[PDB]
Copies of this chain bind each other. A is one copy, B any other.
């Protein structure tokens, strides 16, 4: 059931036709950007994981 399992993939990702698998192990993920903002009794601190 193609239309069922095709819906599970995320909206941003649309994969191409071919895939040359040449191993018994494949990592899959995404490269996201995190913008953290910290606050406590001592004070405030702002950072960013690129």
Contacts and interface: CB of A to CB of B under 8 A. Distances in A.
Nearest to A47: B50
A38 to B, nearest CB: 12
Contact residues of A: prevailing secondary structure = loop
Nearest to A50: B47
Given A12-B44, A14-B42, A33-B46, 8 more contacts: A12-B42, A12-B43, A13-B41, A13-B42, A13-B43, A14-B41, A30-B43, A31-B45
A40 to B, nearest CB: 9
6 contacts: A12-B43, A12-B44, A13-B41, A13-B43, A31-B45, A33-B46
Contacts of A12: 42-44
